């Protein structure tokens, strides 16, 4: 514990299909079958990222995410962004900054294993692996490529205050992700919703996989204009919203 | 400020003698003439480090410091430790861990300049420069050599709680350093003294350059057994103490 201070590395088991399962929260980290496509639909689709990028009136796009996990959302976004830059080299938007929080960071071995699930993503994955920081408290910035990733280790509820009033109205999209509310209820607070709301740029967006009613009412109370949207595949319902 | 969050890099001026002066606190960071020797006397001498090392009954020695500054205390300790390991290769004590806090970290250019003052220290200095972390909040661990340096960026008063009860009784010596109480009064709190006291190993020590009476009474209240000791050179008085 001089080793880690208060941080606990993730405890994973790989299940019969080879999927990473969190032993901290008792759930798979992603869909073995549909993980990439689902991430694209929920977080890219829900925040309309692909449509927005060529019309974005600033040189920087800022994404903030509540639970990093395996980094699937991030890698998916980085691919999408890279694809956007190839198709639109002369757009106003030139740079991406991603800010994420994680209470139980994966070890580098578990991380490499998780990523083997997505060979399409390997070029970006291998870059994240190469700079994967030690599980210590606070902000670890990775300079990739144009693309910056800030990884905050610790508790998002205690951490979010560190994003002081200087970051207000600077987040273009929120990935409200991590384990389900029934699996990790501690993450899903009014404190968090409120902070998300103050960090959001006007017209900035949020998406989440859950439609738990308290989560919708909590975001609405924080100040987002929320709507339901069909879930991925056979799933009925997800939530997304816009500031103002 | 997406750049730095709340961290402000140190603002320095170099004076007519070429000494780094903090424009944040309006004082030189060290004695242009006597800096190394003074650091050795106050922090190594005050905590009796050189005598203690060959008799230390554990494989790890832990030092915690309140303000890193230029890293002079750390570099001085690292030299001393390296010298100890050469003279005593088969001692029980084999490893050093150093934990330090800094609210205004120096830029890498200012850092290199500061270190030019101590050519004796260049072998260690160049190593610190090579791994000098970005000015971001939280814990940045440097693996040097056997020697580990944890650099905490932010406010020590807000940070010290992050050294939870898992680090209690694990600090062998405290360097109570940084700017004078009259120059940076915010650092010098009962909260800090109390935390120092709970982190200390029984028989663990503290040294400081100040003998401000509130500082002595504050350490005594926290639980250290304090005594005065002659200051370096013509200086009258410094403070040092032992837990129990």
Descriptive notes:
2 copies of one chain form a homodimer. The first copy, chain A, has 8 helices and 11 strands. With 244 residues, the first copy, chain A, is α/β, with parallel strands linked by helices. The first copy, chain A, has a single domain, classed as Vaccinia Virus protein VP39 (Rossmann fold). An 8-stranded mixed β-sheet of chain A has the order 6-7-5-4-8-9-11-10, with helices on both faces. Chain A has a 3-stranded antiparallel β-sheet with strand order 1-2-3. In chain A, strand 4 (60-65), helix 3 and strand 5 form a beta-alpha-beta unit. The A-B interface holds A 1-2, 5-6, 60, 62, 97, 134, 136-141, 150, 152-154, 162-164, 166-167, 170 and B 1-2, 5-6, 60, 62, 97, 134, 136-141, 150, 152-154, 162-164, 166-167, 170.
Summarize the structure.
Chain A has 244 residues and is α/β, with parallel strands linked by helices.
